[PDB]
A paper describes a structure:
We also imaged SVV complexed with TEM8 under physiological conditions (pH 7 and 37°C). For both physiological and acidic conditions, the A-particles were resolved to 3.4 Å, while for the ER-particles, the resolutions were 6.4 and 4.3 Å, respectively. The A-particles obtained in both conditions are expanded by ~5% in diameter compared to the F-particle. This expansion results in reduced capsid protein contacts compared to the F-particle. Inter-pentamer contacts are reduced by 34% and 22% under acidic and physiological conditions, respectively. For the A-particle[P], additional disordered regions without interpretable density include VP1 (G13, S20, and S28), VP2 (D12), and VP3 (E61-S66), while for the A-particle[C], these include VP3 (P60-D67). On the capsid exterior, the A-particle[P] had the following partially ordered regions: the VP1 HI loop (S229), VP1 BC loop (A65), VP1 Loop II (G97), and VP2 residues V59 and D67, while the A-particle[C] exhibited similar behavior showing partially ordered regions: VP1 HI loop (T230) and VP1 Loop II (P95-G97). At the interior, the A-particle[P] displayed partially ordered regions in the VP1 N-terminus (S1-S28), VP2 N-terminus (R13-G20), VP3 FG loop (G160-N162), and VP4 N-terminus (S38, G63-K72). Interestingly, under physiological conditions, no receptor density is observed on the A-particle[P]. In the SVV A-particle, its genome is reorganized and lacks defined capsid-RNA interactions with the inner capsid surface, likely contributing to the flexibility of the VP1 N-terminus, which is consequently poorly resolved.
Seneca Valley virus (SVV) is an oncolytic picornavirus that selectively targets cancer cells by recognizing Tumor endothelial marker 8 (TEM8) as the host receptor. SVV has a typical picornavirus capsid with four capsid proteins; VP1, VP2, and VP3 are characterized by a single jelly roll fold, where eight beta-strands form a barrel-like structure that is distributed at the exterior of the virus, while VP4 is located on the interior of the capsid. The structural architecture consists of four capsid proteins forming a protomer, 5 protomers forming a pentamer, and 12 pentamers assembling into a pseudo T=3 capsid, approximately ~32 nm in diameter. We used cryo-electron microscopy to investigate SVV under acidic conditions and in complex with TEM8 at physiological pH, identifying multiple uncoating intermediates.
Numbering used by the authors:
A (entry chain B), E (entry chain B): 1 to 60, 67 to 238
B (entry chain C): 13 to 279
C (entry chain A): 1 to 12, 14 to 19, 21 to 27, 29 to 258
D (entry chain D), G (entry chain D), H (entry chain D): 14 to 38, 63 to 72
F (entry chain A): 1 to 12, 14 to 19, 21 to 27, 29 to 104
């Protein structure tokens, strides 16, 4: 006979993310095989792990992806930027674009550099990473105390700087609004330790290219909605 | 009833003692490095493995029931309140971003058998009494004129803690309650000891590390607050003795540090 | 009997002095007590794309849409934002705008600890007869998407679609679902004493102590706006709750 | 455990029903010990 | 084919305390571990078993939590109060606050005292507990016959008095309205057996502190709604 | 560290320079991410037999029923037909017929 | 696999639930090899 | 027992379906015995 039942309070509801299937309408259909197509993707982290280029405002569009070393300097890093993924410099990189669609991230960012200039030149650079503080460090003396390393021009013109992950919480927010300790994580800067020696007959002013990507232990947790602004 | 605890190059003696209260868990000393960071941390060493000492205001008959004083930790080190000077510990604190440590304190008084009264000391966690209602920490000069904080309905209701002004767009509500009230009748819930004038002179507590994250910012954390309150007002025969004094000692345990940088500065 | 309560740790029935050891007969368990629904807040229902309130302080003459949206947290809130001092407008008619406020009376009547954690189970109940509506929610630290698009000369607000859950209920229906603990902080601080920013912060104001945000809207185009307002009710439940350290209880007046 | 009555059948998987913490790889104790 | 069914009379109902789960909407989310936090709570009886302080009206706010011994007395206990948990004296104690949110209780209440005064003083006190009667006992002669004990000032200044649980029903109501035999359970009183000898140069008038808590066999059964009066 | 990114294939945490190997804790999977509903288009409702739109270009004075029907594809579409350039009518009132997109 | 919670019972047959291709009879590989 | 017909499946647990007393640890008898 009939089986007694009791419908719950949430009957006839429609959920846009309910983990369940639906009844088929036109089933029993075969499809051609696709074993001939190589390069199948499984996780977007595979694409996130690929280096890309950054942007910079340039002197007064002007968003060249490289920074040019001046001749005379004044006690100040050549270029510095925060470590907030919502910053403009991260807009077009794959890591920034992908992360913008998720709430929480976790892991180590990766930065890579490369030199472009005359072969027979020489110089030395210093890279720094300063955790959050009351004021952004400026002088080389301040910079030296924090974590840093020294880059020397030689046979190999590329160098990778790994930004350690330190925070009071296991995860961190991806976009910053109040600049709380949960989103901002300090600054990065580049300082010219020595003066670059341009060999004779090589005109002047070499250039540096910035390469950014995700570390080997990156991760994202919560999906969110997108911004359709690109259509306008 | 006679014991001494030795640490680093300093020691403390107790002519009278009931023991040490171990708080929530046995052996609070045990701990492990945090998990919200990768850079190698800095651990304990002899320079900081030692005690520190400070002073409090005096106790006078004029004080009434339930008045109290508070000493935030580790903010006391930074503020140099009561003459406490952390030295090496303060120097290391100012040069780091993340910290995690326990605490272990003791309070002593010089009451004699010819006095009557009682004192209560407890480690209230996650409280804000140092800040003025305006939203600014109480300065050392301001802390002198008023020796003891006067209990009042405002503090009892938690109606005067720091807040954010809404602005001209809205209308000003009537504030009546907040989640940081103070309930004098229930302070004994936290670990405590009664400093009676006829039973003992020194009390001591041992507490572990707590917090809503595996590690907390080293420039703003206020997890533990030391609170001293008066239950029975002091009274004695005239001409015998006047206004005893108070002191306390602190010592961190199994700390960790992360995020090296230059000296902290504001602006 | 002999004892020393000044030491704090006192010993521990009638068998000790005169006994009676009445046999047991677990209704106070933390996991069991906190599993039951309770009202949280009452909110309006949208009929078009809205402008989220600006952060405090809000100057005079600022255009926005207030009264909608609502946080998911027991701690006091004001204008759909975290707050510390709870307040209410007991005074008669005044001026300006009145700020919606909320609080969990039942939760705070027994909130005798500091740290808490549990899963949240939300449901929604209508008030006006034969009303059709829907709900939308997004995690903590996210933002509400504004603006609208045109379909056959009808302005459809963007919030119709998104990667976050949506719920459509039949005419005169009800909604319900369970969300996961998603805030970055490991546990929820019932009472806090830290600061969230290095400078210009407010002591004792937590940053991301909540479960998310909720709003209600009608499945109609913006070209069919009406006049009469509508209201909606909200309830919450706790699953597998846990507490982590003792605390005090609210004070009762002796009047 | 908890105010749950059903004890015969759980439809959805545990991972999709409740959150789970990721690995990092009567008798009531008293909240105060006095050495 | 379709399975026959018959919905019951209570379909589409919403219950605020139904013991059942709900469908998930955003499942498959991980959370950081919390094994680092010590002092987890399991049952509120753990907090109920902790001593706290009482209140008293004091002579004509005035609600000091202690009672002061006078000099001359008149055939009357120093302080007495009922054993109804709704009484004002139990308002702010943890046991009273917790019990006020439940209907039925069961077990033995516990009372603890402590002396505060000059060391070299002496005296003797008598504690009494009188089950329900037509009139509250007043005189020491009456008090002596009922259950009682004698407290002597000495090296230890604290004493615990356990109130036995006797009633015609297994459980008892927590709040009293009609003062029926099911709620009220008699009175408690304190009598000065001797005269306190204040040593010379110790001024006068010692004080006594009252400590109350729950016994080892306490219990509560039925939850109820709360009173939001504390918000006003 | 030493590397040569001009070659393209670069090598691969803090254990390499200074480490930290934070344990895992798969929300980005292709199969999982794309399983959730999203609005596609809004269409009218028929009340009689209709005449399907003619293929482009459609000359002036052609009788048909437009605004109904809708393809099932993420790629841009116009007038219920496949298209390449996405467009919209942000301009005020004009003339002719407006093409659904 | 996928955002599917049910793990107890599938009513309709697999062929009628999902398409099937007809026969013609953590660890993540890198998308670039450099000999 | 009682006016209950179902004899195949009880969904909710017995403790949540009926009250239970806590432990303190045809043929019809006549209501009157005459010694």
């Amino acid at each position: 006979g009939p089986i007694p039942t009791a419908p719950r309070e949430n009957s006839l509801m429609f959920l846009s993310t309910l983990p369940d299937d639906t009844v088929p309408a036109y089933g029993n259909v075969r499809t051609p095989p696709v074993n001939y197509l190589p390069g199948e993707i499984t996780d977007l982290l595979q694409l996130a792990r690929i280096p890309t280029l950054m942007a910079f405002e340039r002197v007064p569009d002007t968003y060249v992806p490289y920074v040019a070393v001046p001749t005379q300097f004044d006690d100040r890093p050549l270029i510095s930027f925060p470590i907030t993924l919502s910053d403009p410099v991260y807009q077009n990189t794959l890591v920034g674009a992908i992360s913008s669609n998720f709430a929480n991230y976790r892991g180590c960012i990766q930065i890579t550099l490369t030199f472009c200039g005359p072969m027979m030149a020489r110089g030395k650079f210093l890279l720094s990473y300063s955790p959050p503080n009351g004021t952004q460090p400026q002088t080389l003396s301040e910079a030296m105390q924090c974590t840093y390393s020294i880059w020397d021009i030689g046979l190999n013109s590329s160098w990778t700087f790994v930004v350690p992950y330190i925070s009071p919480s296991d995860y961190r927010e991806t976009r910053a609004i109040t600049n709380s300790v949960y989103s901002a994580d300090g600054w990065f800067s580049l300082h010219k330790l020595t003066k670059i020696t341009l060999p004779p007959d090589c005109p002047q002013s070499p250039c540096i290219l910035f390469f950014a990507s995700a570390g080997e232990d990156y991760t994202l947790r919560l999906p969110v909605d997108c911004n359709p602004s690109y259509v306008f | 009833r006679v014991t001494t605890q030795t640490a680093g190059n300093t020691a403390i003696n107790t002519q009278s003692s009931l023991g040490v209260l171990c708080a929530y868990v046995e052996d609070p000393t045990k701990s492990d490095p945090p998990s919200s960071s990768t850079d190698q941390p800095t651990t304990t060493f002899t320079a900081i493995d030692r005690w520190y000492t400070g002073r409090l205001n005096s106790w006078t008959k004029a004080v009434k029931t339930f008045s109290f004083q508070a000493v935030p930790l580790p903010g006391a080190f930074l503020s140099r309140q009561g003459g406490l000077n952390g030295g090496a510990f303060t120097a290391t604190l100012h040069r780091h971003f993340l910290m995690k440590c326990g605490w272990q304190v003791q309070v002593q008084c010089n009451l004699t058998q010819f006095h009557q009264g009682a004192l209560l000391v407890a480690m209230v966690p996650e409280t804000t009494l140092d800040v003025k209602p305006d939203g600014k920490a109480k300065s050392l000069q301001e802390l002198n004129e008023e020796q003891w904080v006067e209990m009042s309905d405002d503090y009892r209701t938690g109606k005067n803690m720091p807040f954010q002004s809404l602005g001209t767009y809205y209308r000003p509500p009537n504030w009546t309650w907040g989640p940081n009230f103070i309930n004098p009748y229930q302070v004994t819930v936290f670990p405590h000891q009664i400093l009676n004038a006829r039973t003992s002179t020194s009390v001591d507590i041992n507490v572990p590390y707590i917090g809503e994250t595996p590690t907390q910012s080293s420039e703003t954390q206020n997890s533990w607050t030391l609170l001293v309150m008066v239950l029975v007002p002091l009274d004695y025969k005239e001409g015998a003795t006047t206004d005893p004094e108070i002191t306390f000692s602190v010592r961190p345990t199994s700390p960790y540090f992360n995020g090296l940088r230059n000296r902290y500065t504001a602006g | 009997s002999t004892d020393n309560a000044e030491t704090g740790v006192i010993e521990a029935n009638t068998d000790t002095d005169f006994g009676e050891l009445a046999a047991p007969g677990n209704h106070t368990n933390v996991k069991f007590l906190f599993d039951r629904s309770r009202l949280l807040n009452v909110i309006k229902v949208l009929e078009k794309d809205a402008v989220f309130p600006r952060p405090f302080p809000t100057q005079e003459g600022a255009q926005q849409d207030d009264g909608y949206f609502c946080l998911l947290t027991p701690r006091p809130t004001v204008a759909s934002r975290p707050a510390t001092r709870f307040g209410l407008y007991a005074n008669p008619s005044g001026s300006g705008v009145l700020a919606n406020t909320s609080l969990d009376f039942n939760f705070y009547s027994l909130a005798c600890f500091t740290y808490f954690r549990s899963d949240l189970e939300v449901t929604v109940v209508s008030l006006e007869p034969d009303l059709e509506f829907a709900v939308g929610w997004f995690p903590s630290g996210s933002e509400y998407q504004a603006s609208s698009f045109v379909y056959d000369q009808l302005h459809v607000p963007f919030h119709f679609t998104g990667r976050t859950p949506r719920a459509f209920a039949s005419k005169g229906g009800k909604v319900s679902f369970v969300l996961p603990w998603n805030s970055v902080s490991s546990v929820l601080p019932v009472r806090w004493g830290g600061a969230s920013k290095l400078s210009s912060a407010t002591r004792g104001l937590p940053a991301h102590a909540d479960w998310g945000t909720i709003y209600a809207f009608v499945p109609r185009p913006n070209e069919k706006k009406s006049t009469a307002v509508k209201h909606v009710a909200v309830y919450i439940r706790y699953k597998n709750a846990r507490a982590w350290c003792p605390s005090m209880l609210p004070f009762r007046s002796y009047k | 455990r908890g105010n749950n009555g059903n004890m015969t059948f759980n439809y959805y998987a545990n991972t999709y029903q409740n959150s789970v913490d990721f690995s990092t790889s009567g008798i009531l104790n008293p909240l105060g010990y006095l050495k």
